[PDB]
Design a protein around this ligand. Structure first.
Ligand SMILES: O=C([C@@H]1O[C@H](CO)[C@H](O)[C@H](n2cc(-c3cc(F)c(F)c(F)c3)nn2)[C@H]1O)N(CCO)C1CC1
Length: 138
């Protein structure tokens, strides 16, 4: 187990068939979680479960370029629960990030940042206890 926030190094960036697994438990009174795949100061892929946005649960995904957030992609499907252990898996494909939570497909996010081999850090933050963060090649 690790104390958030935590940065997982992705040396030489990401590549298709790279599978990132994040294990943790959502805190009992959680408001938000974020994964940030970073290319320097840019955020290639921000994955942001929000537990109370206007009293609704939503997944917000976005990219940050030159310190500006772009067009949000939102999902109503919300697989997380306060207090409960989770597994987030991010599969890097040639054209998108694929996300599954607790072994169920959640969403895919088209690559806006094209230089996958420069996406060299994964930031993990928010209202979780972080158990582990690792990757393998499938
Ligand atoms: O609220 C936002 C921003 O939306 C952006 C995506 O469009 C980011 O989510 C921004 N964000 C979240 C976090 C964050 C999240 C966590 F879970 C953390 F634990 C943590 F430490 C930080 N850091 N930046 C967010 O301020 N907006 C209003 C409409 O959605 C958009 C900008 C117009």
């Amino acid at each position: 187990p690790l104390i958030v926030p935590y940065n997982l190094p992705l040396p030489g960036g990401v590549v298709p068939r790279m599978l990132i697994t994040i294990l943790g438990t959502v805190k009992p009174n959680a408001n938000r979680i974020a994964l940030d795949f970073q290319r320097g100061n840019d955020v290639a892929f921000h994955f942001n479960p929000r537990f109370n946005e206007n009293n609704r649960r939503v997944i917000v995904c976005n990219t940050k370029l030159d310190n500006n957030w772009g067009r949000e992609e939102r999902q109503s499907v919300f697989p997380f629960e306060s207090g409960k252990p989770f597994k987030i898996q991010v599969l890097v494909e040639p054209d998108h990030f694929k996300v599954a939570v607790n072994d169920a497909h959640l969403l895919q996010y088209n690559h806006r940042v094209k230089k996958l081999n420069e996406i060299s850090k994964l930031g993990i933050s928010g209202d979780i206890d972080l158990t582990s963060a690792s990757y393998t090649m499938i």
